[PDB]
Design an enzyme around this catalytic site. Structure first.
Site, mmCIF file in Angstrom:
data_model
loop_
_atom_site.group_PDB
_atom_site.id
_atom_site.type_symbol
_atom_site.label_atom_id
_atom_site.label_comp_id
_atom_site.label_asym_id
_atom_site.label_seq_id
_atom_site.Cartn_x
_atom_site.Cartn_y
_atom_site.Cartn_z
ATOM 1 N N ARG A 115 69.523 32.640 -24.663
ATOM 2 C CA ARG A 115 69.002 31.932 -25.516
ATOM 3 C C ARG A 115 69.947 32.161 -26.837
ATOM 4 N NH1 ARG A 115 65.569 34.120 -27.722
ATOM 5 N NH2 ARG A 115 64.793 35.619 -26.113
ATOM 6 N N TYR B 1 71.088 26.667 -20.068
ATOM 7 C CA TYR B 1 70.440 27.810 -19.573
ATOM 8 C C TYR B 1 68.684 28.150 -19.925
ATOM 9 C CZ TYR B 1 71.122 32.841 -18.222
ATOM 10 O OH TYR B 1 71.089 33.956 -17.450
ATOM 11 N N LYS C 197 59.543 28.780 -23.027
ATOM 12 C CA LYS C 197 59.418 29.216 -24.364
ATOM 13 C C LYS C 197 59.415 27.897 -25.487
ATOM 14 C CE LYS C 197 60.759 33.255 -23.167
ATOM 15 N NZ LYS C 197 59.854 34.288 -23.076
ATOM 16 N N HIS D 71 53.742 36.115 -25.869
ATOM 17 C CA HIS D 71 54.988 36.738 -24.952
ATOM 18 C C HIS D 71 54.415 37.512 -24.266
ATOM 19 C CE1 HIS D 71 59.454 38.043 -24.840
ATOM 20 N NE2 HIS D 71 59.135 37.159 -23.822
ATOM 21 N N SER E 95 61.855 40.473 -25.378
ATOM 22 C CA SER E 95 62.758 40.024 -24.257
ATOM 23 C C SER E 95 63.481 41.202 -23.807
ATOM 24 C CB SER E 95 63.516 38.899 -24.898
ATOM 25 O OG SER E 95 62.808 37.880 -25.424
ATOM 26 N N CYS F 172 62.505 43.965 -22.240
ATOM 27 C CA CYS F 172 62.065 45.543 -22.492
ATOM 28 C C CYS F 172 60.834 45.639 -21.734
ATOM 29 C CB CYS F 172 61.589 45.306 -24.289
ATOM 30 S SG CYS F 172 62.938 45.157 -25.403
ATOM 31 N N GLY F 173 60.783 45.022 -20.517
ATOM 32 C CA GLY F 173 60.056 45.614 -19.570
ATOM 33 C C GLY F 173 58.927 44.929 -18.730
ATOM 34 N N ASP G 65 55.210 36.889 -18.431
ATOM 35 C CA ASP G 65 56.025 36.415 -19.605
ATOM 36 C C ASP G 65 55.257 35.968 -20.570
ATOM 37 O OD1 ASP G 65 58.952 36.524 -20.472
ATOM 38 O OD2 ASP G 65 58.537 34.270 -20.622
ATOM 39 N N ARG H 130 69.942 36.236 -14.170
ATOM 40 C CA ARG H 130 68.490 35.956 -13.793
ATOM 41 C C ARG H 130 68.338 35.522 -12.392
ATOM 42 N NH1 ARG H 130 64.655 36.857 -18.230
ATOM 43 N NH2 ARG H 130 65.942 37.616 -20.097
HETATM 44 N N1 LIG Z 1 64.382 52.775 -18.421
HETATM 45 C C1 LIG Z 1 63.398 51.825 -18.181
HETATM 46 N N2 LIG Z 1 64.111 50.427 -18.022
HETATM 47 C C2 LIG Z 1 63.014 49.447 -17.710
HETATM 48 C C3 LIG Z 1 61.623 49.974 -17.607
HETATM 49 N N3 LIG Z 1 61.135 48.631 -17.452
HETATM 50 C C4 LIG Z 1 61.887 47.777 -17.267
HETATM 51 N N4 LIG Z 1 63.320 48.224 -17.585
HETATM 52 C C5 LIG Z 1 64.490 47.309 -17.600
HETATM 53 O O1 LIG Z 1 64.590 46.819 -18.628
HETATM 54 C C6 LIG Z 1 65.101 45.442 -18.326
HETATM 55 C C7 LIG Z 1 64.288 44.348 -18.594
HETATM 56 O O2 LIG Z 1 63.033 44.533 -17.981
HETATM 57 P P1 LIG Z 1 62.241 43.081 -17.549
HETATM 58 O O3 LIG Z 1 60.992 43.565 -17.205
HETATM 59 O O4 LIG Z 1 62.871 42.277 -16.822
HETATM 60 O O5 LIG Z 1 61.965 42.619 -19.219
HETATM 61 P P2 LIG Z 1 61.125 41.439 -19.506
HETATM 62 O O6 LIG Z 1 60.293 42.120 -20.824
HETATM 63 O O7 LIG Z 1 60.265 41.016 -18.569
HETATM 64 O O8 LIG Z 1 62.031 40.307 -20.261
HETATM 65 P P3 LIG Z 1 62.176 38.691 -20.377
HETATM 66 O O9 LIG Z 1 61.844 38.217 -18.971
HETATM 67 O O10 LIG Z 1 63.581 38.630 -20.806
HETATM 68 O O11 LIG Z 1 61.115 38.458 -21.440
HETATM 69 C C8 LIG Z 1 65.627 45.606 -16.724
HETATM 70 O O12 LIG Z 1 66.854 45.797 -16.607
HETATM 71 C C9 LIG Z 1 64.682 46.770 -16.122
HETATM 72 O O13 LIG Z 1 65.209 47.415 -15.101
HETATM 73 C C10 LIG Z 1 61.137 51.220 -17.605
HETATM 74 O O14 LIG Z 1 59.820 51.477 -17.510
HETATM 75 N N5 LIG Z 1 62.096 52.215 -18.017
HETATM 76 O O1 LIG Z 2 64.362 35.954 -23.413
HETATM 77 C C1 LIG Z 2 63.257 36.071 -22.809
HETATM 78 O O2 LIG Z 2 62.119 36.424 -23.249
HETATM 79 C C2 LIG Z 2 63.021 35.266 -21.606
HETATM 80 O O3 LIG Z 2 62.036 35.328 -20.906
HETATM 81 C C3 LIG Z 2 64.380 34.571 -20.956
HETATM 82 S S1 LIG Z 2 64.519 32.874 -21.710
HETATM 83 O O4 LIG Z 2 63.525 32.078 -20.829
HETATM 84 O O5 LIG Z 2 64.287 32.960 -23.103
HETATM 85 O O6 LIG Z 2 66.013 32.372 -21.147
HETATM 86 MN MN LIG Z 3 60.371 38.868 -17.416
HETATM 87 MN MN LIG Z 4 60.585 36.439 -22.223
#
Ligand SMILES: Nc1nc2c(ncn2[C@@H]2O[C@H](COP(=O)(O)OP(=O)(O)OP(=O)(O)O)[C@@H](O)[C@H]2O)c(=O)[nH]1
Ligand SMILES: O=C(O)C(=O)CS(=O)(=O)O
Ligand SMILES: [Mn+2]
Ligand SMILES: [Mn+2]
Ligand code: NA
Length: 624
Positions: free
Chosen positions: A89, A237, A246, A266, A288, A290-291, A313, A407
């Site tokens: 994004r 993308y 989004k 979100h 985004s 952050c887990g 998400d 991704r």
């Molecule tokens: N150290 C740590 N890293 C984490 C934790 N949970 C997730 N991560 C890492 O943070 C990254 C993002 O985690 P996701 O769960 O994919 O994040 P998301 O909030 O789903 O992100 P979007 O899909 O972008 O909205 C990855 O590289 C994970 O391995 C955690 O509990 N501890």
């Molecule tokens: O950035 C985010 O929070 C995502 O979930 C990925 S995207 O769909 O915005 O590309």
């Molecule tokens: Mn995600």
């Molecule tokens: Mn997201």
């Protein structure tokens, strides 16, 4: 729909339709397709049916053209590598159009808003005219009829996306419910109008990089909520191009939700069952990268606990007549960050992504598999790796094998712990809402809000290290209220008032609000908490608190666990005093920063109750 009236042969695109029929389309669908074909001048129009046959053929075609590669180690998985200018994004090129700037963002005292970007309709028309005319020349315009929410559910919202990218069509098939059935469900009903182009009409005026069409200089992702239009140009993308996610399900929907009395957030939604046979659903807003995805399909380490995933998400929620806050996941798949994913950190994701999955910007092993940082699987001697830059790569090189925002795009139905209620039109009842982000200092592992109004303040006050999900570099701690900073469909002050208003709704059963921090670090920059499956220990505490357990101690920031309240068995080496520490000096600085941010950025639209919470937290901290 009917043939447009003609004095010649220039408006009826029937002769260019290579799948489906303009005559079969609902009238307004036809006018939308044909008007934009007149504008964009595609060579062909393909009305998607969503069939397996269509998908197979489109993938094989992208393969021929070198736009994607088949991953031969897996069952029906594919890899796309993008131009390195188009990898995430871009918030600065994402805008909402309204008559008045204040309807879209509060007017910031400083003069630059951090809570969205507004553009006048006049300026947008100029931008639009400089981009779309002729933009699909020589290409196919695909028409994607998609439902956000289960086919034919009364709480589904339907869109039509026109695109010149087959990669967007394939990805939309996974991330939404797509095809003929959706047209049948739509009939003469209203739909969100989504128009996308990669912005590279043929013959190409600019070089094609990595077989990935895009126009970075003219990239613009626009939302026109009164017109019910999303118009995106120049990026192929993720959140820029998959317009149901989004752009529709958060930005358009959050504004509709304000008007109609629900919420679009979100947030993941998960169901957690304890060793006593009780199940509760929780929602969680983290920014985004952050887990969320890793929490939503967690494999808990505590015995007797089970997590199931409803969505990872986006959540659409509303209080029902019984006062329960009921949530649905409008998506049909997971578009997850790949790096960091391993059997140890997210084994349910590893199982989900081994078939029918499209990967973008990951590395490829010589035996046709995938690779990324943190995958934690050694390769056999002799197996080599091609990085996401399409170059030979070795573990010793300067750069990652996969882009940090690479991704997977995978069907939700394949997740081994997908919740049995994930497609229920009734939604699931949320009993707790969790906020949190990346804070390396000061913020303890978990706390609980003191009240609804304090909990809405906690969401409003969220800050978090920048990630690779958009254009922000470095690790600067940014405000990201409700994890919605990139995604507000309207004025954030009004959104706060909308959240506060839920307290006054009839019979409302307000969920408990928590804040977590998985990312606190010690002096050496190492994590104080192992996270992933171990986060089940924090969820256990939240579960007990929801049930009314006396397991909380009052502090100036909210309730935290009593000494010995958390199960830390098997984690004897965790430094509880550091992880749970609350420092007056840190928090004095923190409340001053939040005060200045809310004053500048929300200003005249800051609800009195949120200012009151700020004054109350400042007071509690002063008495430390
Ligand atoms: N150290 C740590 N890293 C984490 C934790 N949970 C997730 N991560 C890492 O943070 C990254 C993002 O985690 P996701 O769960 O994919 O994040 P998301 O909030 O789903 O992100 P979007 O899909 O972008 O909205 C990855 O590289 C994970 O391995 C955690 O509990 N501890
Ligand atoms: O950035 C985010 O929070 C995502 O979930 C990925 S995207 O769909 O915005 O590309
Ligand atoms: Mn995600
Ligand atoms: Mn997201
Ligand atoms: Na490519």
């Amino acid at each position: 729909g009917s043939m447009p009236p003609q004095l010649h042969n220039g408006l009826d695109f029937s002769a260019k339709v290579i799948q489906g029929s303009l005559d079969s389309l609902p009238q307004e669908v036809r006018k939308f397709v044909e008007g934009n074909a007149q504008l964009c001048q595609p060579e062909y129009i393909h009305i998607c049916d969503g069939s397996e046959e269509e998908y197979g053929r489109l993938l094989a075609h992208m393969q021929e053209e070198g736009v994607i590669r088949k991953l031969k180690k897996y069952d029906n998985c594919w890899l796309a590598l993008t131009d390195p200018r188009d990898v995430a994004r871009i918030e600065s090129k994402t805008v909402i159009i309204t008559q008045e700037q204040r309807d879209t963002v509060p007017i910031p005292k400083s003069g630059q808003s951090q809570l969205g970007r507004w553009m006048s309709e006049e300026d947008f028309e100029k931008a639009f005219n400089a981009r779309f005319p002729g933009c699909m020349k020589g290409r196919t315009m695909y028409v994607i009829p998609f439902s956000m929410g289960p086919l034919g559910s009364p709480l589904a919202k339907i869109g039509i996306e026109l695109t010149d990218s087959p990669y967007v069509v394939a990805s939309m098939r996974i991330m939404t419910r797509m095809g003929t059935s959706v047209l049948e469900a739509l009939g003469d009903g209203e739909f969100i109008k989504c128009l996308h182009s990669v912005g590279c009409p043929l013959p190409l005026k600019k070089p094609l990089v990595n077989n990935w069409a895009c126009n970075p200089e003219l990239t613009l992702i626009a939302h026109l909520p009164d017109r019910r239009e999303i118009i995106s140009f120049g990026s192929g993308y993720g959140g820029n191009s998959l317009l149901g996610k989004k752009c529709f399900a958060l930005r358009i929907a959050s504004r509709l939700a304000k008007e109609e009395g629900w919420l679009a957030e979100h947030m993941l939604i998960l169901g957690i069952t304890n060793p006593e046979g009780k199940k509760k659903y929780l929602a969680a807003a983290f920014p985004s990268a952050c887990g969320k995805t890793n929490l939503a399909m967690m494999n808990p380490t505590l015995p007797g606990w089970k997590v199931e995933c409803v969505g990872d998400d986006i959540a659409w929620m509303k209080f029902d007549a019984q006062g329960n806050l009921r949530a649905i996941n409008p998506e049909n798949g997971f578009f997850g960050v790949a790096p960091g994913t391993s059997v140890k950190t997210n084994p349910n994701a590893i199982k989900t992504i081994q078939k029918n999955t499209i990967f973008t910007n990951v590395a490829e092993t010589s035996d046709g598999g995938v690779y990324w940082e943190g995958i934690d699987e050694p390769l056999a001697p002799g197996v080599t790796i091609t990085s996401w830059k399409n170059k030979e790569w070795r573990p010793q090189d300067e750069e990652p094998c996969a882009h940090p925002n690479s991704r997977f795009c995978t069907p939700a139905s394949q997740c081994p712990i997908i919740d049995p209620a994930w497609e229920s039109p009734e939604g699931v009842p949320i009993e707790g809402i969790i906020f949190g982000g990346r804070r390396p200092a000061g913020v303890p592992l978990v706390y609980e809000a003191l009240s609804w109004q304090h909990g809405v303040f906690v969401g409003a006050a969220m800050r978090s290290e920048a990630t690779a999900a958009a254009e922000h570099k470095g690790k600067v701690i940014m405000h990201d209220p409700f994890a919605m900073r990139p995604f507000f469909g309207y004025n954030f002050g009004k959104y706060l008032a909308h959240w506060l208003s839920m307290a006054h709704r009839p019979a409302a059963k307000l969920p408990k609000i928590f804040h977590v921090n998985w990312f606190r670090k010690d002096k050496n920059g190492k994590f104080l908490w192992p996270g992933f499956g171990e986060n089940s220990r924090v969820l256990e505490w939240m579960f007990g608190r929801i049930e009314g357990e006396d397991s909380a101690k009052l502090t100036p920031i909210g309730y935290v666990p009593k000494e010995d309240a958390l199960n830390l068995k098997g984690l004897g080496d965790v430094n509880v005093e550091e992880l749970f520490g609350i420092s007056k000096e840190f928090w004095e600085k923190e409340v001053e920063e939040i005060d200045k941010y809310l004053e500048d950025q929300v200003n005249a639209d800051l609800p009195y109750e949120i200012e009151r919470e700020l004054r109350a937290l400042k007071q509690r901290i002063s008495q430390m």
